[PDB]
Amino acid sequence: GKYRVYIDQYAKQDYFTVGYKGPNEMDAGIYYAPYVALTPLRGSDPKNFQPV
Amino acid sequence: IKKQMEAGALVEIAEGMATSIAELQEGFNGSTDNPWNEMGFRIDKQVIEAKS
Numbered sequence: 001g002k003y004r005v006y007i008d009q010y011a012k013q014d015y016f017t018v019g020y021k022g023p024n025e026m027d028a029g030i031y032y033a034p035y036v037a038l039t040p041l042r043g044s045d046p047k048n049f050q051p052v
Numbered sequence: 053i054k055k056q057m058e059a060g061a062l063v064e065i066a067e068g069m070a071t072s073i074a075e076l077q078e079g080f081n082g083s084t085d086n087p088w089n090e091m092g093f094r095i096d097k098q099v100i101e102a103k104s
Contacts, residue, residue, distance in 0.1 A: 048080045050079075
């Protein structure tokens, strides 16, 4: 009926955690705000020409 | 020196660079002192005057 279950892969001993999450995004208890995604960068130092 | 070479004590050699000391040249993984070898070119003039 109600709850949704997520398994903790790297659990310490045996804990189970219950929490709330409202439909509105603001009712969380913890906010994860991403600003910019992975920005790739490439280059090569001329002293050795080895790609980085 | 030329006398020594004929006796076989000294013999001319031409070797490559080890592929573990060649990849890291002038930087890269924790290297300290390994400069590259470079080349170049110079160009100069020469004057001349006529007589009678």
